[PDB]
Design a protein around this motif. Structure first.
Motif, PDB file in Angstrom:
ATOM      1  N   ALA A 149      -5.806  -1.268  -7.649  1.00 33.56           N
ATOM      2  CA  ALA A 149      -6.942  -0.499  -7.196  1.00 33.56           C
ATOM      3  C   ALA A 149      -6.393   0.763  -6.563  1.00 33.56           C
ATOM      4  O   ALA A 149      -5.325   0.756  -5.939  1.00 33.56           O
ATOM      5  N   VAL A 150      -7.133   1.848  -6.729  1.00 32.42           N
ATOM      6  CA  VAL A 150      -6.644   3.155  -6.344  1.00 32.42           C
ATOM      7  C   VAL A 150      -7.844   3.999  -5.939  1.00 32.42           C
ATOM      8  O   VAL A 150      -8.975   3.745  -6.361  1.00 32.42           O
ATOM      9  N   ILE A 151      -7.610   4.987  -5.083  1.00 31.76           N
ATOM     10  CA  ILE A 151      -8.648   5.927  -4.673  1.00 31.76           C
ATOM     11  C   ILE A 151      -8.155   7.367  -4.858  1.00 31.76           C
ATOM     12  O   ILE A 151      -7.003   7.702  -4.536  1.00 31.76           O
ATOM     13  N   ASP A 152      -9.040   8.229  -5.360  1.00 30.51           N
ATOM     14  CA  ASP A 152      -8.704   9.628  -5.575  1.00 30.51           C
ATOM     15  C   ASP A 152      -9.232  10.480  -4.424  1.00 30.51           C
ATOM     16  O   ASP A 152      -9.823   9.978  -3.470  1.00 30.51           O
ATOM     17  N   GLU A 153      -9.047  11.791  -4.525  1.00 30.65           N
ATOM     18  CA  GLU A 153      -9.402  12.667  -3.415  1.00 30.65           C
ATOM     19  C   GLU A 153     -10.910  12.841  -3.269  1.00 30.65           C
ATOM     20  O   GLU A 153     -11.366  13.346  -2.238  1.00 30.65           O
ATOM     21  N   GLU A 154     -11.692  12.434  -4.262  1.00 33.14           N
ATOM     22  CA  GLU A 154     -13.144  12.401  -4.147  1.00 33.14           C
ATOM     23  C   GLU A 154     -13.636  11.147  -3.431  1.00 33.14           C
ATOM     24  O   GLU A 154     -14.852  10.971  -3.270  1.00 33.14           O
ATOM     25  N   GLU A 173       4.439  13.634 -25.777  1.00 28.29           N
ATOM     26  CA  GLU A 173       4.192  14.510 -24.651  1.00 28.29           C
ATOM     27  C   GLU A 173       3.617  13.722 -23.475  1.00 28.29           C
ATOM     28  O   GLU A 173       2.765  12.831 -23.645  1.00 28.29           O
ATOM     29  N   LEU A 174       4.097  14.055 -22.278  1.00 36.48           N
ATOM     30  CA  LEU A 174       3.591  13.478 -21.046  1.00 36.48           C
ATOM     31  C   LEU A 174       2.661  14.485 -20.386  1.00 36.48           C
ATOM     32  O   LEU A 174       2.901  15.696 -20.458  1.00 36.48           O
ATOM     33  N   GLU A 175       1.572  13.994 -19.794  1.00 39.34           N
ATOM     34  CA  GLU A 175       0.602  14.864 -19.130  1.00 39.34           C
ATOM     35  C   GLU A 175       0.253  14.325 -17.742  1.00 39.34           C
ATOM     36  O   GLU A 175       0.435  13.143 -17.441  1.00 39.34           O
ATOM     37  N   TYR A 176      -0.258  15.220 -16.897  1.00 39.28           N
ATOM     38  CA  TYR A 176      -0.674  14.888 -15.537  1.00 39.28           C
ATOM     39  C   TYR A 176      -2.147  14.506 -15.619  1.00 39.28           C
ATOM     40  O   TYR A 176      -3.020  15.370 -15.753  1.00 39.28           O
ATOM     41  N   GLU A 177      -2.420  13.200 -15.548  1.00 37.11           N
ATOM     42  CA  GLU A 177      -3.784  12.703 -15.666  1.00 37.11           C
ATOM     43  C   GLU A 177      -4.534  12.821 -14.336  1.00 37.11           C
ATOM     44  O   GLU A 177      -5.651  13.333 -14.298  1.00 37.11           O
ATOM     45  N   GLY A 178      -3.945  12.388 -13.229  1.00 37.97           N
ATOM     46  CA  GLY A 178      -4.658  12.473 -11.965  1.00 37.97           C
ATOM     47  C   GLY A 178      -3.793  12.087 -10.785  1.00 37.97           C
ATOM     48  O   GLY A 178      -2.753  11.431 -10.927  1.00 37.97           O
ATOM     49  N   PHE A 179      -4.239  12.519  -9.605  1.00 40.52           N
ATOM     50  CA  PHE A 179      -3.584  12.204  -8.344  1.00 40.52           C
ATOM     51  C   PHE A 179      -4.466  11.260  -7.523  1.00 40.52           C
ATOM     52  O   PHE A 179      -5.699  11.385  -7.502  1.00 40.52           O
ATOM     53  N   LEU A 230       0.829  -1.203   0.000  1.00 38.16           N
ATOM     54  CA  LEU A 230       0.000   0.000   0.000  1.00 38.16           C
ATOM     55  C   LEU A 230       0.865   1.254   0.000  1.00 38.16           C
ATOM     56  O   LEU A 230       1.844   1.351   0.747  1.00 38.16           O
ATOM     57  N   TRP A 231       0.491   2.220  -0.840  1.00 44.52           N
ATOM     58  CA  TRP A 231       1.249   3.461  -0.986  1.00 44.52           C
ATOM     59  C   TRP A 231       0.280   4.636  -0.982  1.00 44.52           C
ATOM     60  O   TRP A 231      -0.924   4.469  -1.223  1.00 44.52           O
ATOM     61  N   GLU A 232       0.813   5.829  -0.701  1.00 45.97           N
ATOM     62  CA  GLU A 232       0.025   7.057  -0.715  1.00 45.97           C
ATOM     63  C   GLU A 232       0.669   8.115  -1.609  1.00 45.97           C
ATOM     64  O   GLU A 232       1.868   8.069  -1.913  1.00 45.97           O
ATOM     65  N   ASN A 233      -0.145   9.106  -1.987  1.00 49.13           N
ATOM     66  CA  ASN A 233       0.315  10.287  -2.719  1.00 49.13           C
ATOM     67  C   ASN A 233       0.929   9.888  -4.064  1.00 49.13           C
ATOM     68  O   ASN A 233       2.138  10.023  -4.276  1.00 49.13           O
ATOM     69  N   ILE A 234       0.058   9.387  -4.957  1.00 49.57           N
ATOM     70  CA  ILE A 234       0.456   8.798  -6.241  1.00 49.57           C
ATOM     71  C   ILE A 234      -0.043   9.689  -7.372  1.00 49.57           C
ATOM     72  O   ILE A 234      -1.208  10.112  -7.368  1.00 49.57           O
ATOM     73  N   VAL A 235       0.814   9.916  -8.375  1.00 45.73           N
ATOM     74  CA  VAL A 235       0.384  10.518  -9.637  1.00 45.73           C
ATOM     75  C   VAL A 235       0.306   9.437 -10.712  1.00 45.73           C
ATOM     76  O   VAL A 235       1.115   8.492 -10.744  1.00 45.73           O
ATOM     77  N   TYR A 236      -0.703   9.539 -11.563  1.00 44.53           N
ATOM     78  CA  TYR A 236      -0.707   8.822 -12.831  1.00 44.53           C
ATOM     79  C   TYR A 236      -0.279   9.811 -13.897  1.00 44.53           C
ATOM     80  O   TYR A 236      -0.958  10.820 -14.119  1.00 44.53           O
ATOM     81  N   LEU A 237       0.856   9.547 -14.525  1.00 44.67           N
ATOM     82  CA  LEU A 237       1.301  10.325 -15.667  1.00 44.67           C
ATOM     83  C   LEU A 237       1.172   9.457 -16.911  1.00 44.67           C
ATOM     84  O   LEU A 237       1.467   8.257 -16.873  1.00 44.67           O
TER      85      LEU A 237
END
Length: 759
Positions: free
Chosen positions: A595-600, A576-582, A396-403
């Motif tokens: 499996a992942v959870i976002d800030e919503e 090009e690389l983009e910031y899709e979500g945190f 388990l990890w926290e504070n992840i970006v999907y690029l």
């Protein structure tokens, strides 16, 4: 707006028909002067005089080349000179094309198998479904009297339902005082009534759910027996019934028969493909099915006919709702590909890419290569390489970006000018070398495919800008469909390159795109670890998940964004690389499973959820709560407790016996598709109600403590009652609950043994 084209043959001469809607008027233009043709590549021009004299013998009539004119064109990067051979009739082409190809001075023939009315659309630069023209749609469905052993349509149609703007109605020949049912004397008059509301509504679109294979064929056989002329075409014809593979499809001349079944089956992946499955997994609400056998019961009876008439009108209003959802998508798709909505909505993706390409090749005077023969088509059987997948960091990890890469494979095709016509060209001044495979792609001139793709991506961005700038949500959604469809088109060229039936096939191109893709993901990953201190947790093909171990949320976000600027000034061309979500927390069980959870607090899952014929709500509930314990609470131990509690409560019988309903779908007729199981028992128990179990025919059931095998005693929840009924807890633990959560908790080191407790 052009709705469709076909052609008729009058005194052996083809006449093209254009079906049009313009200022609210339906029109039919005719074109008697469009000439079928093929192209011939000749070793020497003097052979043309032999070829002009070639003649077949077709139904007694001598068919020949009507004329020949020399044309200059491009073909796979190089200029080519070929002979355009004209004919009187499109169907003269097969009989004479093998004879022409036999001529020893003929190297090859081209563009010989392109349907005449589709040839028309391309050559005349015409585009179906263009403009603002409002189009009147109408859905319909039928319910029929069915009985085992009878042939198709031995029994009458009982109800014809339709639905549109005004609402939904049912036409039938038995009295039902419900106010949406209209009653007439006869099956005959029902069918005539149907034909009459069509004439007077005059829709441009007829929406069915599997009308290609049921409704239209039923209404044909019945109106034949009753001697009714099934006139639905605005031109006075019966529905026309083409083949497509084994199954069939139906045209209604002057209108668009929009069958939602082919369309749905290739959009959202449902487990089964019933009208009820569709509606509940598109709109949200549920829909009741009434089996065939109950309808027969209700029609021989007095009452019960109100429920069926509800089910009939509820076939019609949902089809019209579903048709309103999926139609503008297909209208946009028809505009983009340049072919009729009818063909567009019934065609495989690679086939739509090829019609787009054929239209572009004509616009650019590019000769089309031929579809492969059977033997070449077997040569193009390579397995392909597939992009880069990283073995994920466990736990388990926290504070992840999907690029991720913006349109990775299109970006590469353009950026590296990857194209059959640029492949290993000689004396090239400027080339890019595909990694690993070493294919050299000349850049001295734009490749055919890259030159098409560039304007597509451009257009996509221009459509997204218009989408966001227009206040009107109907327009926004139209523009959004157009935008998405352009992106699917553009993202389909990589697959097209390896598509064995492709005219512009190119194995080297496919291998090269995949390899560049690997290089770009790998080096981008190495960069963010070695320069920005990120830890890449997982990566699949065009994207990666990453964190800074220890940093807080705003720090990884802000540093993620710095790295985008860093790496995007280094990436060549369109890459090009983009910031899709945190994602505040996530875990990666294995490749393709995470499996992942976002800030919503929205949990997103991949390769873990329940795709099963045997899905039950105790399972769906229990998987959902262990995910919520790992991802919302960040507490893996609690997740384990939850499974222990739920297994205990199943065996001490404390669990509401209805969340233990197994809605199962049937794949094969009950011939023991599964050797045995609950299904063979519930079949016996609902044969008591008169029902047979057919493909589809969702079966809901609870599994009871019986004798014999666990999971051999099963009943419908209908027949369940919490006295003289106990569910088999061992079946629900080992078959429903634990299989839904085993994979998740294995990723945290727990085995199935640790997820129960008895003794």
């Amino acid at each position: 707006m052009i709705l469709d084209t076909d052609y008729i043959t009058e005194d052996g001469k083809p006449v093209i028909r254009i079906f049009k809607k313009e200022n609210g008027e339906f029109k039919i233009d005719y074109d008697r002067n469009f000439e079928p043709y093929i192209y011939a590549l000749l070793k020497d021009d003097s052979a043309i005089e032999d070829v002009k004299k070639i003649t077949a013998e077709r139904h007694g009539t001598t068919v020949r080349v009507v004329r020949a004119e020399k044309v200059k064109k491009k073909f796979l990067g190089r200029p080519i000179e070929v002979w355009k051979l004209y004919f009187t009739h499109p169907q003269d082409q097969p009989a004479i094309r093998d004879k022409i190809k036999e001529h020893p001075a003929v190297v090859d023939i081209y563009e010989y198998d392109i349907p005449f009315a589709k040839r028309y659309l391309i050559d005349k630069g015409l585009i179906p479904m263009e403009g603002d023209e409002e189009l009147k749609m109408l859905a319909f469905a039928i319910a029929t009297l069915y009985h085992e052993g009878e042939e198709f349509a031995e029994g009458p149609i009982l109800m014809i339902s339709y639905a549109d703007e005004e609402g939904a109605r049912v036409i039938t020949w038995k009295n039902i005082d419900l106010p949406y049912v209209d009653v007439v004397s006869t099956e005959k008059e029902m069918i005539k009534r149907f034909l009459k509301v069509v004439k007077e509504k005059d829709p441009d679109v007829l929406i069915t759910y599997n009308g290609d294979n049921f409704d239209f064929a039923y209404l044909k056989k019945r109106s034949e027996k009753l001697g009714v002329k099934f006139i639905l075409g605005r031109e006075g014809s019966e529905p026309k019934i083409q083949r497509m593979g084994d199954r069939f499809a139906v045209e209604v001349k002057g209108r668009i028969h929009f069958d939602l079944y082919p369309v749905i089956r290739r959009t959202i992946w449902l487990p089964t493909y019933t009208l009820e499955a569709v509606y509940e997994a598109i709109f949200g609400q549920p829909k009741e099915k009434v089996y065939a056998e109950e309808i027969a019961q209700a029609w021989e009876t007095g009452e019960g006919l109100e429920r069926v008439a509800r089910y009939s009108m509820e076939d019609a209003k949902v089809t019209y709702e579903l048709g309103k959802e999926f139609f503008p998508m297909e209208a946009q798709l028809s505009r983009l590909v340049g072919q009729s909505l009818w063909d567009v909505s019934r065609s495989s993706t690679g086939n739509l890419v090829e019609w787009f390409l054929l239209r572009k090749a004509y616009e650019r005077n590019e000769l089309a290569p031929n579809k492969p023969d059977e033997r070449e088509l077997a040569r193009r059987r390579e397995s392909y390489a597939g992009g880069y997948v990283k073995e994920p960091e466990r736990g388990l990890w926290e504070n992840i970006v999907y690029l991720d890469f913006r349109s990775l494979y299109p970006s590469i095709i353009i950026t590296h000018n990857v194209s059959p016509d640029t492949l290993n060209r000689e004396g090239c001044g400027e080339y890019d070398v595909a990694p690993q495979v070493g294919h050299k792609f000349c850049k001295d001139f734009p490749g055919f495919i890259p030159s098409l793709l560039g304007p597509l991506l451009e257009e996509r961005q221009k459509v997204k800008k218009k989408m966001k700038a227009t206040i009107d949500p109907i327009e926004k959604k139209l523009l959004d469909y157009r935008q998405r469809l352009i992106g699917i088109l553009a993202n389909s060229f990589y697959g097209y390159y390896g598509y064995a039936k492709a005219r512009w096939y190119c194995k080297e191109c496919a291998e090269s795109v995949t390899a560049w893709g690997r290089q770009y993901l790998e080096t981008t990953i190495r960069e963010i670890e070695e320069k920005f201190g990120f830890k890449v947790l997982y990566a699949d093909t065009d994207g990666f998940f990453a964190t800074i171990p220890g940093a807080d949320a705003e720090t990884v976000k802000k540093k993620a964004k710095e790295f985008l600027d860093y790496i995007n000034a280094k990436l060549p061309g369109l890459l090009e690389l983009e910031y899709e979500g945190f994602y505040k927390r996530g875990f990666f069980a294995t490749k393709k499973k995470y499996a992942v959870i976002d800030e919503e607090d929205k949990i997103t899952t991949v390769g873990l959820e329940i795709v099963r014929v045997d899905w039950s709500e105790i399972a769906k509930e229990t998987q959902a709560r262990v995910l919520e314990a790992i991802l919302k609470h960040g507490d893996v131990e609690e997740a384990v407790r939850i499974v222990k509690e739920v297994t205990e409560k199943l065996s001490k019988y404390e669990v509401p016996p209805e969340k233990l309903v197994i809605y199962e779908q049937i794949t094969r007729d009950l011939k023991d598709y599964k050797a045995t199981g609950p299904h063979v028992a519930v079949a016996e128990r609902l044969a008591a109600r008169g029902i047979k179990i057919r493909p589809g025919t969702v079966i809901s059931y609870i599994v009871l403590k019986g004798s014999g095998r666990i999971g051999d005693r099963a009943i419908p929840f209908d027949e369940f009652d919490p006295a003289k009924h106990r569910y088999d807890a061992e079946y629900y633990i080992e078959n429903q609950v634990l299989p839904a959560v085993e994979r998740i908790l294995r990723a945290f080191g727990y085995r199935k043994e640790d997820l129960r407790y008895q003794k």
